[PDB]
Design a protein around this nucleic acid. Structure first.
Ligand SMILES: [Mg+2]
Ligand SMILES: [Mg+2]
Ligand SMILES: [Mg+2]
Ligand SMILES: [Mg+2]
Ligand SMILES: [Mg+2]
Ligand SMILES: [Mg+2]
Ligand SMILES: [Mg+2]
Ligand SMILES: [Mg+2]
Ligand SMILES: [Mg+2]
Ligand SMILES: [Mg+2]
Ligand SMILES: [Mg+2]
Ligand SMILES: [Mg+2]
Ligand SMILES: [Mg+2]
Ligand SMILES: [Mg+2]
Ligand SMILES: [Mg+2]
Ligand SMILES: [Mg+2]
Ligand SMILES: [Mg+2]
Ligand SMILES: [Mg+2]
Ligand SMILES: [Mg+2]
Ligand SMILES: [Mg+2]
Ligand SMILES: [Mg+2]
Ligand SMILES: [Mg+2]
Ligand SMILES: [Mg+2]
Ligand SMILES: [Mg+2]
Ligand SMILES: [Mg+2]
Ligand SMILES: [Mg+2]
Ligand SMILES: [Mg+2]
Ligand SMILES: [Mg+2]
Ligand SMILES: [Mg+2]
Ligand SMILES: [Mg+2]
Ligand SMILES: [Mg+2]
Ligand SMILES: [Mg+2]
Ligand SMILES: [Mg+2]
Ligand SMILES: [Mg+2]
Ligand SMILES: [Mg+2]
Ligand SMILES: [Mg+2]
Ligand SMILES: [Mg+2]
Ligand SMILES: [Mg+2]
Ligand SMILES: [Mg+2]
Ligand SMILES: [Mg+2]
Lengths: 68, 95, 155, 114
RNA sequence: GUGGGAGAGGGUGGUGGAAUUCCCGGAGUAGCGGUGAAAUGCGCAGAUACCGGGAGGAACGCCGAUGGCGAAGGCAGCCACCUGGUCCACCCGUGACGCUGAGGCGCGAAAGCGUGGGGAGCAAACCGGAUUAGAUACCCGGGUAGUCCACGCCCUAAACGAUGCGCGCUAGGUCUCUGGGUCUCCUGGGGGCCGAAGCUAACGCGUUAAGCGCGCCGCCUGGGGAGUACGGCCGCAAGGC
């Protein structure tokens, strides 16, 4: 279930877009690994940098509790 | 109690109580030394001292060998001490 | 028993009640191979089991055996630096064996002078739930239980 | 007197503690492996967690508690057993959430943990 | 020179959340904590577990990698500024302007030192509890320097790839990071693995050589005595060369 396919053509590097970015976080809030996001290396970097900006802005979380 | 066998040798009350005294070193560990038995013996190279002892946690067996009889006996106790500290501490690897 | 599984012998059923459980018992009464002896005791007791408390000595015997077999027992493992008494169920094999053993053992500690009487009475009481044997059972079983929380170290 | 409320499970390697709260999160009653007759490492066991979670729910039911959400903290031997035991309590277990706290690489741990 | 790229390279300011500790308010009761098992310790003077509020310091989870960057030491939340190194393309400028490098100069982990801040967590020394024959330890409960910041010193190391720098030459296979191309692939620069030849005492090395060659520098010459003594230079001392 690879994520870059689960979504269209986008801008990773756009920190305001919470609907795209939310997909790249796990259920627990963690930045998902390449093994999931399907980003390349260079990509996955730009991802995490911008995810992080967004979480400072209040948009994406930092942690989330795990619901069973 | 403690028995000493001087094999093919003419031993003495004095050196007997000396070996009783050297063996006393193992009393250090405070563990029952059951019917200990030393054997003193000549040999062309030098003397030989054997001892075989059972304790609640196992048995000690060892041979000392040397020119001087007394250094043979010491060697014997030195070897016995090691064996005794090992029976006493061995499973403490209980993590 | 390193190698395979250790066969449990079956046993010739007895020449009075035709039931294996009796010979095992008689076997447990036996001492120094003298089996004829081991027999009369059981049967003599069986005289007494009818004489007093008129009933079916077979019934009484087979009852007090089920009144003895321990359902749960402790068997102790070394873990780390302490030896834990551990709760485990007894095999039907082992329960029989523990049944018969405590029965006799407790029998022979009774104050009765004549052996078969001792056997008579111990069985009559165990049928009812009273005696040295029964205790040993209930005992072993409270010693399990209370260890219930060591039931995870269980093989 | 509250029917809806919360169960907090504190599960360490040493013990298991259950505290039941109001919906606001104020303790109604609590229990631990120690509250049952266990001392030493026996407190740590899953059986102990169970016995503790029961007694906690039990006590809670006397204040008329029926529904709880269950909140779980720590990695214990008794973690799962406590969860189980509340479900078999007669309490409703309206949910289960893991809140176990974790540093984003915080304070230096005691030497044991390095 | 022009034009592009990747990066935890360095310095300065600022800034976010998780967590630990403490304090305050609430609610609650008989234990919590800890170990191999315990005890010291904390707790009815209300602890632990739970909720709200506050203070403060340090380190930055996921991403994260066998990854990246740096001459080495070493460098990791996020933002901006100042700034070094380095790679690719174009084949445009100069015209051997190179290589190495005794001395010199500068950088140099941790610990340590000075002056002044700061101090949550951790923790030499130190105090207890256990373990043990004993236990000036390992394990447990406490705990001060220090760990953090500024400035100034110290100059060490298993400071390691135990492998000095530059250049040229000598099969390939595989996966990986980062460029450029007419994109199965081709091709530079880097990080790994397996291996031609060849090397090696063996282990192993092998276009990231320990192969084949040139240049320059450093170093070795049996073990201990000893990185000691003496002299000298350096340092506040420790102590370094
Ligand atoms: Mg405990
Ligand atoms: Mg920086
Ligand atoms: Mg800053
Ligand atoms: Mg309070
Ligand atoms: Mg009071
Ligand atoms: Mg709080
Ligand atoms: Mg690396
Ligand atoms: Mg290094
Ligand atoms: Mg030209
Ligand atoms: Mg020209
Ligand atoms: Mg120089
Ligand atoms: Mg330094
Ligand atoms: Mg320092
Ligand atoms: Mg110093
Ligand atoms: Mg000092
Ligand atoms: Mg200082
Ligand atoms: Mg100071
Ligand atoms: Mg302090
Ligand atoms: Mg002393
Ligand atoms: Mg001490
Ligand atoms: Mg300590
Ligand atoms: Mg401490
Ligand atoms: Mg303090
Ligand atoms: Mg290394
Ligand atoms: Mg060197
Ligand atoms: Mg050099
Ligand atoms: Mg390469
Ligand atoms: Mg490099
Ligand atoms: Mg190789
Ligand atoms: Mg070859
Ligand atoms: Mg190659
Ligand atoms: Mg070589
Ligand atoms: Mg020499
Ligand atoms: Mg010497
Ligand atoms: Mg030195
Ligand atoms: Mg010197
Ligand atoms: Mg000098
Ligand atoms: Mg001077
Ligand atoms: Mg000083
Ligand atoms: Mg040197």
């Amino acid at each position: 279930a690879k994520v870059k396919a689960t979504l269209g053509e986008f801008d990773l590097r756009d920190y305001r877009n919470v609907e795209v970015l939310k997909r790249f976080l796990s259920e627990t809030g963690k930045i998902l690994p390449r093994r999931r996001t399907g980003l390349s290396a260079k990509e996955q970097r730009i991802l995490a940098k911008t995810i992080k900006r967004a979480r400072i802005l209040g948009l994406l979380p930092f942690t989330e509790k795990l619901v069973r | 109690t403690m028995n000493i066998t001087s094999k093919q040798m003419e031993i003495t009350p004095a050196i007997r109580q000396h070996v009783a005294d050297r063996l006393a070193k193992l009393e250090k560990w405070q563990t029952h030394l059951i019917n200990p038995h030393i054997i003193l013996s000549k040999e062309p190279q030098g003397f030989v001292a054997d001892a075989t002892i059972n304790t609640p946690n196992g048995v000690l067996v060892a041979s000392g060998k040397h020119e001087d009889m007394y250094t043979a006996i010491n060697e014997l106790i030195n070897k016995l001490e090691r064996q005794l500290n090992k029976l006493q501490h061995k499973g403490e690897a209980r993590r | 028993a390193r190698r395979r599984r250790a066969e449990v012998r079956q046993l010739q059923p007895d020449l009075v009640y035709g039931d294996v459980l009796v010979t095992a018992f008689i076997n447990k009464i036996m001492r120094d191979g003298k089996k004829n002896l081991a027999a009369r005791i059981f049967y003599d007791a069986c005289k007494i089991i009818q004489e007093k408390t008129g009933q079916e000595p077979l019934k009484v015997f087979k009852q007090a055996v089920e009144n003895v077999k321990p359902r749960m027992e402790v068997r102790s493992r070394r873990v780390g630096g302490a030896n834990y008494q551990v709760p485990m169920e007894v095999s039907p094999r082992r329960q029989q064996s523990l049944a018969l053993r405590w029965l006799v053992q407790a029998a022979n500690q009774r104050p009765e002078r004549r052996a078969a009487v001792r056997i008579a009475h111990e069985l009559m009481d165990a049928a009812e739930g009273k005696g040295g044997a029964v205790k040993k059972k209930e005992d072993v079983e409270r010693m399990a239980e209370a260890n219930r929380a060591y039931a995870h170290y269980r093989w | 007197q509250v029917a809806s409320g919360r169960a907090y499970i504190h599960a360490s390697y040493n013990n298991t503690i259950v505290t039941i709260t109001d919906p606001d999160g104020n303790p109604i009653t609590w229990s631990s492996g120690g509250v049952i007759g266990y001392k030493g490492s026996r407190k740590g066991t899953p059986y102990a967690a169970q016995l503790a979670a029961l007694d906690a729910a039990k006590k809670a039911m006397a204040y008329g508690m029926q529904s709880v959400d269950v909140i779980v903290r720590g990695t214990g031997a008794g973690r799962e057993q406590a969860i189980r035991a509340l479900q078999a309590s007669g309490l409703q277990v309206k949910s289960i959430v893991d809140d176990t706290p974790v540093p984003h690489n915080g304070c230096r741990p005691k030497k044991k943990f390095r």
